[PDB]
Amino acid sequence: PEELQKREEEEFNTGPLSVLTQSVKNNTQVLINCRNNKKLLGRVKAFDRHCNMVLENVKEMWTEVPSKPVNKDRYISKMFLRGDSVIVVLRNPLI
Amino acid sequence: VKLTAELIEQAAQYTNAVRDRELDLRGYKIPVIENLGATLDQFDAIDFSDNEIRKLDGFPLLRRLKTLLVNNNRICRIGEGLDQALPCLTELILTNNSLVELGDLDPLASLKSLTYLSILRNPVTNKKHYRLYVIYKVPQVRVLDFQKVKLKERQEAEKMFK
Amino acid sequence: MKLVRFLMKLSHETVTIELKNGTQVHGTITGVDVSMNTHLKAVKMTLKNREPVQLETLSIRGNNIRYFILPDSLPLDTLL
Amino acid sequence: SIGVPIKVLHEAEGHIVTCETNTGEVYRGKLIEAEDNMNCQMSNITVTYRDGRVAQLEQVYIRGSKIRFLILPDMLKNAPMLK
Amino acid sequence: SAFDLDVVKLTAQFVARNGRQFLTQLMQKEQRNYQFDFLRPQHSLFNYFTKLVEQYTKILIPPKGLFSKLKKEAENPREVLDQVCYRVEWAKFQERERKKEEEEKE
Amino acid sequence: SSKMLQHIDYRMRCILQDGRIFIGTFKAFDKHMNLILCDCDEFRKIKPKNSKQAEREEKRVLGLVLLRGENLVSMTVEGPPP
Amino acid sequence: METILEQQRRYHEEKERLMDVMAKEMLTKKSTLRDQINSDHRTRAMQDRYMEVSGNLRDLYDDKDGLRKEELNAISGPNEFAEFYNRLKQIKEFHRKHPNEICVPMSVEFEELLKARENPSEEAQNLVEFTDEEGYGRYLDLHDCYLKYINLKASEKLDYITYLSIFDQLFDIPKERKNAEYKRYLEMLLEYLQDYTDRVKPLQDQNELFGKIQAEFEKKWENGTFPGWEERAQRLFSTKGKSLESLDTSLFAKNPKSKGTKRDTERNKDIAFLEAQIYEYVEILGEQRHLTHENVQRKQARTGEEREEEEEEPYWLYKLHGLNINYNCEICGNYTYRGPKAFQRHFAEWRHAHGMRCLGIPNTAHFANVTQIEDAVSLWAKL
Amino acid sequence: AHPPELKKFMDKKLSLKLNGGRHVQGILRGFDPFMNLVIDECVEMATSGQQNNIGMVVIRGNSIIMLEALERV
RNA sequence: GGAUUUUUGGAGCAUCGACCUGGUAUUGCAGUACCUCCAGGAACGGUGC
């Protein structure tokens, strides 16, 4: 109810996903690692307790060996990602 | 009565005794086989018993088919483009046919994956050196008319018609 | 709030669900459940290093899906 | 409640079934008792060990977490639960 | 009615190659004991057959494809669209004339 | 909704997690994405492992198959109920 | 066969029916853009079929020039016509009428009230050639092209409005280098856009427009189409200026301009042709690009609910009364009755009186419960 | 949360098959609702011919795939 | 609806199935993991490491 929603808001503001709440605070891009070694850089529009994310203007980069592997990347406008494949989420990326 | 997609859709398709998907078309008297592409490659054996097909031709591209039953028919001529339509054919049942010439089995060597053949109850077996010519034509067949091939039969096939 | 309720309110949308084992099915999503089961129609499915086949209907599970790709003309403010 | 494939697997007890493990092992034997969580206890089981080596084990018990598939006999094909 | 239509088409094909109005290949056939009731204007189907020879004379024009080749109808979609627009305008003018005649009758 | 029950008793092919495909008459389902496939046939692709070898698919019929939801990935319709 | 007489008349009748169908389609009013696009596609298909029929009829004139001497001969004739009448003297036991000689092409070139599509164009669909974001020619989809440009530029400092402003230029300085790989995208973004020229106008001649574009590219764009007041003459391939027209004519056959560079007229001719086609498509469809930009601005300026609203657009009564009970009346042609009271009511009716009037028995009260004709005849003969 | 039917396998010498090709044998002394087993006199046999005695082992239910009873049970 | 059995993720060797020769016993009524044994040639294929 309302108390459970307040407890969920407190756990989202003070818990482990608060940096993800930073993606809902200043609309900053976050770096999410996937199980298929595909790093997605982009802000999170909506999140949940199971780390399911809604990303906007995401850039997904990975390493594909054809020799030396190349950094083939793609750009998705809007995307959804399940929390089961999320490995590591970094709030402030380097570049 | 001609064969169409309605007779194939209304036919019974189930599991045969060889643990394969078979559709029964017995008692149809189809003079020509056509429009067989409606099965969507979901069958491995097609029975065509009690039919009036004069020539076994007009077969669409089916890769899942592995057994052909054309027994009790009136097939006098054989088609040539059968290997390009059934690449995974393994069993061929051409019993009770109207094959008279030895050349009618000449496109039958086009199937590379064929191993079982049945040409019983035919006038083409009535001529001399029929099994030797069938062994010399298609060496990939292992069972011809419910009989396994032999090394002496292969030697007699390679020695003859040199 | 859970993200399954936002995905459940989607019908006749041409999305692209990328599965876990290198599979990607692009099609019109016709049904979504609370367990993220996606039932779509007129789908083009491309597996890992394979040719894209076409299916009239498909039913992918929730645990087998890895990521989703929504169209650009899809507001996220009204779905949340 | 109870699932309909779970009820079909519970009705398949007492007959010769064949379960498939996650490592590729196929064990065919008489299913003595089944559980709601796909726990299959089988007697006179024949293991393949994902290499074709069929050995004969007695009173085997495979959990539902590694059970990928379970080949039920065709005699339960006319069950009223499947309709 | 296929045999009567084929006989009418054969009569329209044979009558159109005549060099005169009464010196045709069907006038001598009437005197040659070949019964053809569609030659007289008392039958309604002759009103179709007089159209059919009118089609056969339409197969006798020099732009009909005997000694010339049509280029505007065969290689210009804009000319066909302009002809369709002119036909639609003629149909609208005929409908307006019919409405004016109905208003005058009223 | 009941989208999963609309494709019941039809010839459907379900893709496994290991890459195999089980084609059969899906008679019964549950909340755990289990499947009861009557007269099921499993097809598994084999690697060519050479430069000129082609890719084949070994197909084996099992009959009634009770497939758990942990191995099922996606299911598609292939044929009408016979 | 009468190829000169019957086949040419049949082709002319088919062309006249196609022209009448096109005039009936053009005379009818339109209410929606999708229905108008479907009608234009059906008219383009009918025009292509009429052009194919005219091309087939225009080639049937080789034997006609040899057979005109035999056809024009009035001394010969009716003996061959007598042989044709003897050959047309076949079995007339085929009792079947065929009114579909001219009625079937008339009905094939028409539509139904439930679905406004012709019989050859019954399988055509507007959803198989255009996307939902396009609106059947109302707008152009540029999200994938913007994503490809953002992937090629490798920078996130370019939005959709910046991409539209970069694509709005026709003859200005480019955003990237002409020798880079972005031109490989610029062909592909042209490859849909020229297809939009096939999409937004199916009734226009695409081959004549392509020939005019090729003539403008060969005769004008390759010959200095942009004169100035290095600024006097600019080359699209070499990307370099020229002092005079004589120097440009002398450098047009030069070795670095032919095949001796990475942007010469040998390898980079297709990229320049694709750029010229993209410029012509942007100049021809600038109103559609402005409408797409206005729609993108309206979608960006709206809230969530406004964007969602924009994207969303009895056995007991039959058992108690004695019904469903079979009763046979042999007088009225062995008719059936589903009730005893219904049979008693239909006995004193017009149908039973008409059935009894054929046998000659008068309608009286003595033959009320009479069913068999042999009993009614004896009852009539007894009185 | 129903416990498995491991009452017949209690106090009997069996051999389990863990994930990754591991194999151990011993006497099952108890059972858990999460299929966790306790094995006394447990000997694990790797790919080599040698077998290492463990004494008392506790195996989780998420790794055990099958268990063959070496006794009559 | 997020904590081990289903749904918010462990991501050249061994073995079996075939192909072809020889000799050998069983002639037998049933709803099936596989079925007589020995010797010989193979330039056949599936799974894991």
PDB file of N, CA and C in Angstrom, chain H residues 17-68:
ATOM      1  N   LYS H  17      25.726 -37.482  -8.524  1.00  0.00           N
ATOM      2  CA  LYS H  17      26.403 -36.921  -9.691  1.00  0.00           C
ATOM      3  C   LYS H  17      26.217 -35.408  -9.662  1.00  0.00           C
ATOM      4  N   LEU H  18      27.263 -34.691  -9.261  1.00  0.00           N
ATOM      5  CA  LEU H  18      27.214 -33.243  -9.168  1.00  0.00           C
ATOM      6  C   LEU H  18      27.461 -32.609 -10.536  1.00  0.00           C
ATOM      7  N   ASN H  19      27.369 -31.281 -10.573  1.00  0.00           N
ATOM      8  CA  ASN H  19      27.580 -30.541 -11.804  1.00  0.00           C
ATOM      9  C   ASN H  19      29.066 -30.466 -12.142  1.00  0.00           C
ATOM     10  N   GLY H  20      29.348 -30.285 -13.429  1.00  0.00           N
ATOM     11  CA  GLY H  20      30.715 -30.194 -13.900  1.00  0.00           C
ATOM     12  C   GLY H  20      31.459 -31.507 -13.981  1.00  0.00           C
ATOM     13  N   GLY H  21      30.758 -32.637 -13.934  1.00  0.00           N
ATOM     14  CA  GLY H  21      31.403 -33.930 -14.015  1.00  0.00           C
ATOM     15  C   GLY H  21      31.905 -34.486 -12.704  1.00  0.00           C
ATOM     16  N   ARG H  22      31.539 -33.883 -11.578  1.00  0.00           N
ATOM     17  CA  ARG H  22      31.971 -34.388 -10.283  1.00  0.00           C
ATOM     18  C   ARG H  22      31.152 -35.612  -9.888  1.00  0.00           C
ATOM     19  N   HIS H  23      31.782 -36.505  -9.127  1.00  0.00           N
ATOM     20  CA  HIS H  23      31.140 -37.734  -8.677  1.00  0.00           C
ATOM     21  C   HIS H  23      31.597 -38.037  -7.258  1.00  0.00           C
ATOM     22  N   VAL H  24      30.640 -38.299  -6.371  1.00  0.00           N
ATOM     23  CA  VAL H  24      30.920 -38.653  -4.988  1.00  0.00           C
ATOM     24  C   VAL H  24      29.974 -39.769  -4.574  1.00  0.00           C
ATOM     25  N   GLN H  25      30.388 -40.536  -3.567  1.00  0.00           N
ATOM     26  CA  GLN H  25      29.583 -41.627  -3.037  1.00  0.00           C
ATOM     27  C   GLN H  25      29.668 -41.634  -1.519  1.00  0.00           C
ATOM     28  N   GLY H  26      28.606 -42.104  -0.878  1.00  0.00           N
ATOM     29  CA  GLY H  26      28.596 -42.172   0.568  1.00  0.00           C
ATOM     30  C   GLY H  26      27.227 -42.542   1.092  1.00  0.00           C
ATOM     31  N   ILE H  27      27.129 -42.541   2.419  1.00  0.00           N
ATOM     32  CA  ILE H  27      25.890 -42.879   3.109  1.00  0.00           C
ATOM     33  C   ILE H  27      25.130 -41.593   3.403  1.00  0.00           C
ATOM     34  N   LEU H  28      23.903 -41.499   2.895  1.00  0.00           N
ATOM     35  CA  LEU H  28      23.073 -40.324   3.133  1.00  0.00           C
ATOM     36  C   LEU H  28      22.523 -40.360   4.554  1.00  0.00           C
ATOM     37  N   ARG H  29      22.801 -39.307   5.328  1.00  0.00           N
ATOM     38  CA  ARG H  29      22.377 -39.236   6.717  1.00  0.00           C
ATOM     39  C   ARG H  29      21.197 -38.306   6.956  1.00  0.00           C
ATOM     40  N   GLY H  30      20.778 -37.541   5.958  1.00  0.00           N
ATOM     41  CA  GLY H  30      19.665 -36.625   6.138  1.00  0.00           C
ATOM     42  C   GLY H  30      19.267 -36.012   4.815  1.00  0.00           C
ATOM     43  N   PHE H  31      18.206 -35.210   4.871  1.00  0.00           N
ATOM     44  CA  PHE H  31      17.689 -34.540   3.688  1.00  0.00           C
ATOM     45  C   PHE H  31      17.178 -33.161   4.078  1.00  0.00           C
ATOM     46  N   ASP H  32      17.109 -32.278   3.086  1.00  0.00           N
ATOM     47  CA  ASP H  32      16.650 -30.909   3.281  1.00  0.00           C
ATOM     48  C   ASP H  32      15.500 -30.617   2.323  1.00  0.00           C
ATOM     49  N   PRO H  33      14.648 -29.626   2.614  1.00  0.00           N
ATOM     50  CA  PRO H  33      13.620 -29.237   1.631  1.00  0.00           C
ATOM     51  C   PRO H  33      14.184 -28.608   0.367  1.00  0.00           C
ATOM     52  N   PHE H  34      15.400 -28.068   0.410  1.00  0.00           N
ATOM     53  CA  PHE H  34      16.065 -27.560  -0.784  1.00  0.00           C
ATOM     54  C   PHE H  34      16.973 -28.594  -1.437  1.00  0.00           C
ATOM     55  N   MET H  35      16.693 -29.887  -1.236  1.00  0.00           N
ATOM     56  CA  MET H  35      17.418 -31.032  -1.796  1.00  0.00           C
ATOM     57  C   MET H  35      18.891 -31.070  -1.384  1.00  0.00           C
ATOM     58  N   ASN H  36      19.243 -30.449  -0.261  1.00  0.00           N
ATOM     59  CA  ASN H  36      20.614 -30.509   0.226  1.00  0.00           C
ATOM     60  C   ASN H  36      20.829 -31.795   1.014  1.00  0.00           C
ATOM     61  N   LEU H  37      21.853 -32.551   0.640  1.00  0.00           N
ATOM     62  CA  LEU H  37      22.129 -33.843   1.245  1.00  0.00           C
ATOM     63  C   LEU H  37      23.378 -33.783   2.118  1.00  0.00           C
ATOM     64  N   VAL H  38      23.427 -34.686   3.095  1.00  0.00           N
ATOM     65  CA  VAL H  38      24.575 -34.858   3.976  1.00  0.00           C
ATOM     66  C   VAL H  38      25.071 -36.284   3.800  1.00  0.00           C
ATOM     67  N   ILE H  39      26.353 -36.431   3.478  1.00  0.00           N
ATOM     68  CA  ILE H  39      26.946 -37.725   3.164  1.00  0.00           C
ATOM     69  C   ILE H  39      28.058 -38.004   4.165  1.00  0.00           C
ATOM     70  N   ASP H  40      27.918 -39.099   4.905  1.00  0.00           N
ATOM     71  CA  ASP H  40      28.969 -39.616   5.766  1.00  0.00           C
ATOM     72  C   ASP H  40      29.718 -40.724   5.038  1.00  0.00           C
ATOM     73  N   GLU H  41      31.006 -40.871   5.384  1.00  0.00           N
ATOM     74  CA  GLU H  41      31.961 -41.754   4.695  1.00  0.00           C
ATOM     75  C   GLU H  41      32.011 -41.449   3.199  1.00  0.00           C
ATOM     76  N   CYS H  42      32.036 -40.156   2.874  1.00  0.00           N
ATOM     77  CA  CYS H  42      31.949 -39.717   1.488  1.00  0.00           C
ATOM     78  C   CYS H  42      33.317 -39.783   0.821  1.00  0.00           C
ATOM     79  N   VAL H  43      33.376 -40.442  -0.333  1.00  0.00           N
ATOM     80  CA  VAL H  43      34.575 -40.518  -1.156  1.00  0.00           C
ATOM     81  C   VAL H  43      34.242 -39.912  -2.513  1.00  0.00           C
ATOM     82  N   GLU H  44      35.031 -38.926  -2.925  1.00  0.00           N
ATOM     83  CA  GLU H  44      34.852 -38.299  -4.228  1.00  0.00           C
ATOM     84  C   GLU H  44      35.851 -38.875  -5.224  1.00  0.00           C
ATOM     85  N   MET H  45      35.352 -39.266  -6.394  1.00  0.00           N
ATOM     86  CA  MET H  45      36.176 -39.818  -7.463  1.00  0.00           C
ATOM     87  C   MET H  45      36.205 -38.828  -8.617  1.00  0.00           C
ATOM     88  N   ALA H  46      37.396 -38.335  -8.940  1.00  0.00           N
ATOM     89  CA  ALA H  46      37.587 -37.395 -10.034  1.00  0.00           C
ATOM     90  C   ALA H  46      37.799 -38.165 -11.339  1.00  0.00           C
ATOM     91  N   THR H  47      38.433 -37.515 -12.318  1.00  0.00           N
ATOM     92  CA  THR H  47      38.720 -38.181 -13.586  1.00  0.00           C
ATOM     93  C   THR H  47      39.797 -39.250 -13.437  1.00  0.00           C
ATOM     94  N   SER H  48      40.690 -39.097 -12.463  1.00  0.00           N
ATOM     95  CA  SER H  48      41.732 -40.085 -12.233  1.00  0.00           C
ATOM     96  C   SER H  48      41.173 -41.303 -11.499  1.00  0.00           C
ATOM     97  N   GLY H  49      42.012 -42.337 -11.389  1.00  0.00           N
ATOM     98  CA  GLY H  49      41.622 -43.545 -10.684  1.00  0.00           C
ATOM     99  C   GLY H  49      41.600 -43.405  -9.177  1.00  0.00           C
ATOM    100  N   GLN H  50      42.241 -42.370  -8.641  1.00  0.00           N
ATOM    101  CA  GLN H  50      42.283 -42.182  -7.197  1.00  0.00           C
ATOM    102  C   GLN H  50      40.981 -41.572  -6.695  1.00  0.00           C
ATOM    103  N   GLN H  51      40.611 -41.925  -5.464  1.00  0.00           N
ATOM    104  CA  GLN H  51      39.412 -41.411  -4.813  1.00  0.00           C
ATOM    105  C   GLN H  51      39.811 -40.795  -3.480  1.00  0.00           C
ATOM    106  N   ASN H  52      39.319 -39.589  -3.211  1.00  0.00           N
ATOM    107  CA  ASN H  52      39.679 -38.855  -2.003  1.00  0.00           C
ATOM    108  C   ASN H  52      38.552 -38.959  -0.981  1.00  0.00           C
ATOM    109  N   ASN H  53      38.889 -39.393   0.232  1.00  0.00           N
ATOM    110  CA  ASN H  53      37.908 -39.507   1.308  1.00  0.00           C
ATOM    111  C   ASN H  53      37.659 -38.131   1.915  1.00  0.00           C
ATOM    112  N   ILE H  54      36.391 -37.808   2.166  1.00  0.00           N
ATOM    113  CA  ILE H  54      36.003 -36.510   2.711  1.00  0.00           C
ATOM    114  C   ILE H  54      35.465 -36.608   4.126  1.00  0.00           C
ATOM    115  N   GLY H  55      35.035 -37.788   4.565  1.00  0.00           N
ATOM    116  CA  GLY H  55      34.512 -37.949   5.907  1.00  0.00           C
ATOM    117  C   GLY H  55      33.067 -37.518   6.048  1.00  0.00           C
ATOM    118  N   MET H  56      32.820 -36.211   5.995  1.00  0.00           N
ATOM    119  CA  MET H  56      31.471 -35.662   6.111  1.00  0.00           C
ATOM    120  C   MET H  56      31.338 -34.529   5.105  1.00  0.00           C
ATOM    121  N   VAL H  57      30.397 -34.666   4.171  1.00  0.00           N
ATOM    122  CA  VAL H  57      30.196 -33.683   3.116  1.00  0.00           C
ATOM    123  C   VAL H  57      28.748 -33.213   3.137  1.00  0.00           C
ATOM    124  N   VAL H  58      28.550 -31.964   2.725  1.00  0.00           N
ATOM    125  CA  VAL H  58      27.230 -31.354   2.620  1.00  0.00           C
ATOM    126  C   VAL H  58      27.090 -30.787   1.215  1.00  0.00           C
ATOM    127  N   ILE H  59      26.194 -31.372   0.425  1.00  0.00           N
ATOM    128  CA  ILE H  59      26.018 -31.005  -0.977  1.00  0.00           C
ATOM    129  C   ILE H  59      24.705 -30.252  -1.130  1.00  0.00           C
ATOM    130  N   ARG H  60      24.736 -29.160  -1.886  1.00  0.00           N
ATOM    131  CA  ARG H  60      23.531 -28.381  -2.132  1.00  0.00           C
ATOM    132  C   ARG H  60      22.662 -29.053  -3.190  1.00  0.00           C
ATOM    133  N   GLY H  61      21.392 -28.643  -3.237  1.00  0.00           N
ATOM    134  CA  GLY H  61      20.471 -29.225  -4.197  1.00  0.00           C
ATOM    135  C   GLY H  61      20.608 -28.651  -5.592  1.00  0.00           C
ATOM    136  N   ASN H  62      21.226 -27.478  -5.715  1.00  0.00           N
ATOM    137  CA  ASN H  62      21.396 -26.831  -7.009  1.00  0.00           C
ATOM    138  C   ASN H  62      22.486 -27.474  -7.858  1.00  0.00           C
ATOM    139  N   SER H  63      23.365 -28.279  -7.263  1.00  0.00           N
ATOM    140  CA  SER H  63      24.441 -28.931  -7.997  1.00  0.00           C
ATOM    141  C   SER H  63      24.185 -30.408  -8.257  1.00  0.00           C
ATOM    142  N   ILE H  64      23.381 -31.067  -7.428  1.00  0.00           N
ATOM    143  CA  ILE H  64      23.109 -32.491  -7.593  1.00  0.00           C
ATOM    144  C   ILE H  64      22.110 -32.681  -8.725  1.00  0.00           C
ATOM    145  N   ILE H  65      22.462 -33.535  -9.683  1.00  0.00           N
ATOM    146  CA  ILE H  65      21.587 -33.803 -10.820  1.00  0.00           C
ATOM    147  C   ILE H  65      20.895 -35.154 -10.688  1.00  0.00           C
ATOM    148  N   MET H  66      21.609 -36.167 -10.207  1.00  0.00           N
ATOM    149  CA  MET H  66      21.045 -37.502 -10.053  1.00  0.00           C
ATOM    150  C   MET H  66      21.764 -38.211  -8.916  1.00  0.00           C
ATOM    151  N   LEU H  67      21.152 -39.290  -8.431  1.00  0.00           N
ATOM    152  CA  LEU H  67      21.710 -40.073  -7.338  1.00  0.00           C
ATOM    153  C   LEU H  67      21.276 -41.522  -7.488  1.00  0.00           C
ATOM    154  N   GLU H  68      22.242 -42.407  -7.718  1.00  0.00           N
ATOM    155  CA  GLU H  68      21.978 -43.831  -7.873  1.00  0.00           C
ATOM    156  C   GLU H  68      22.241 -44.559  -6.561  1.00  0.00           C
TER     157      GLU H  68
END
